[model samples]
Structure formats: structure tokens, C-alpha cells
Target: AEAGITGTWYNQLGSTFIVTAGADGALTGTYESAVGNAESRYVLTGRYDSAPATDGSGTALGWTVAWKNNYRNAHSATTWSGQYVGGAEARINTQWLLTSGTTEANAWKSTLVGHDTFTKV
Candidate 1:
């Protein structure tokens, strides 16, 4: 069974995740950051387990959002990785790694890790 994680999800941090699942586990989404250079909606790419071993209740997935728009001359990308739970109205528990596009690139401290639980609306 494949988890149909297609819907609008919102996080506690006020970020909205709009996801659309496609054939072969393909994913397309828009990520809106609550605060950052990419506060606006940015197109994203990701993948999920279209054919999962389980009952699609817990399907692993990931999505990447690249921030090209500068709020203050900033640029970077963030990859969110996690698993989906539930059916139509579901939840995605994920951890994200935001990569910088500067000397911060080599800065380990610049690599930030964040946990987010998104509930489908």
C-alpha cells in the first residue's frame, strides 16, 4: 500500500506544506517559510514510497526546497526527510537540514537541524 500524502499541511512553526503525489513515488510541493529569506512559497521536489511494504501508514519520504529569492541577499536550500503517517488526513514527522551557499557551506555550525510535525488540513 502506498501512503497518499497529498494535501495541505501546516506546522507549529507556521510553515505551510502543500504536497502533491504523483506516479512512481514522485512528489511536487511548495514550502512557505515562516521566517527566512525564503518566507515566500518556493517550489519543491521530493519522493515517497509509492509501493510500500507496510500498509502505507508509515511511508518514508523526503522533499527539497531551494531558496533562490533573497529576503536580504541570502541563498540556500533545505532538505526535509521523514515518514508519513495516517491516511487522507495525515502527519509527516520530519527532520530538515538547511544547507548554506556560502563559507557557511564549510561551517559545520551553519548546518542546522530542525524537527517538524506537519498535520494535514
Candidate 2:
């Protein structure tokens, strides 16, 4: 089996990330914004058993969104729990919302977020 993957991927909005998958299906990567202004690192520990809904292909998809929503009623929170569409060119889209006890009222919203074509090098 192939192990240790390294590659680059991007999203529609032009956000890009570097991916590196470990031997035990543990994936570690980093996302660098298009303009090279902001960047983030992430690690997901799991794999897919079939193809992802995003691909529309007939294959096992293994992904994760560990957990979402952890905020008080008076506050708000969103979390991108990490995602893996499975396969060589899979995408890992994990965005989040974090709100403790200091979020302004009516200052919460959710949007459709995703990652572009992710290739496993």
C-alpha cells in the first residue's frame, strides 16, 4: 500500500493547502490562502470506506467532520472538523466556527465551504 503522501491543492476561492498523509491513514496538511496572507495547519485521523458524495464517482469514501457546533445560546461557534473524500485526488475541507461566551448577538452565520481538487503525492 502507498504511504506518506505529499501534494498541493486549492479551492474555488483560491485558497491552497499542502497535504501530507501518514502511514496509518493519519493525514496532516496546511492551508495557505491565495494571496499568501493567511495560513493554517490541520491533522485528521481517519480514512474513507467509499467514494465521497462530492466526486459523484462509484468508490468508497472515507471522511471526517469530527464535531461541529460548540457554543452557548448567547454565543455562536462553527468548526470545520476536517474532511477526506478518499482516493489519490481527494480533498480535505475542514472549516470551523468557534464561539465561546463572547460572541455578539445575531453575529452568526453558516456558509457552504469546501476544498478544491486535492491530490495525494
Candidate 3:
């Protein structure tokens, strides 16, 4: 069975990612201290979807969630994708990117990022 990816999650740095899952697998949450720099907090919103099968069983091995930070300035986004590790727990690997405060187009292509993990609370 698929595991629910709700509730709070945190990292070693004291940053937190609190998530809520919808009936349609849509997700919304808040990420506190997300960035290492001054701009760190954001309202996160995204969706959980089945990943493409690699085993050829036609069944998804895991779900991938894509989230975007709701920062009024530069845009930040995260893609966390991994399988459940155990009951009430998961270890979703993440890729985060925060753009520089340039124009809209430049912001999207800005060079700012990191790869991290999100362990369930």
C-alpha cells in the first residue's frame, strides 16, 4: 500500500518541512528555514504523483512530490522523490533551487541550489 506523506519533517540544520496531503494526492506545506541564507522561510505547495516504473511491472515503485516555495521575491522550488522507509517514516531525497533576485526569466534560470533529504517526523 502507498504510505501517506503528511505531517512534519525536519533536517539536522533545524529546518522544518510540514506537509499535508489532499485526497487527490495534492500537497501543501510550510518550509521554515529552508534556505541557508537570509531568505529561508516559505509556504510550500505541490503535488504527489506516481513515478515512472523502472522495474517494468507497470506499478509505480514510489511517489515523487514536487514543491515550490511561496517567496514573494526570488522563486525557490524543491523536488523530493523517494520511497517510504517504514511506517510513519520516509527518506525523500531532495533537490532545491533558489533563484537570484533578477528579472522573472533570469530568476528561473538562476544558479542557486542544493540536494538534501527530508525524513518524516
Among these predictions, the greatest lDDT belongs to 1
Q: Return the lDDT, model 3, position 26.
A: 62
Give one digit per residue, the lDDT tens place, for model 1 in 4-121. Answer: 5777889988889788888788899787779776657788899997565544357889999888644433567889899888755678899999878658457766667888999966
- Give the Å shift of residue 55 in candidate 2: 14
Q: What ranges in model 1 sit over 4 Å off?
A: 1-3, 54-57, 70-73, 104-106
- Tell me the tens digit of each residue's lDDT in model 2 across 8-99: 65666675555555555444555444432223433333343321246454322233322222321323222345445546556555444343
Candidate 2 to truth, TM: 0.39
Note the clash tally of each candidate. 0, 13, 0
State the displacement of the C-alpha of residue 7, model 1, in Å, after optimal TM-score superposition: 1.4
- The residue-by-residue lDDT of candidate 3 on 53-110, one tens digit each, is 4453221122222233444443334444443333444555555554444576665566
**lDDT-better candidate, 1 vs 2:** 1
By TM-score, the candidates rank as: 1, 3, 2
Q: Pick the candidate with the highest TM-score.
A: 1
- Local error of candidate 1 at 48, Å? 0.6
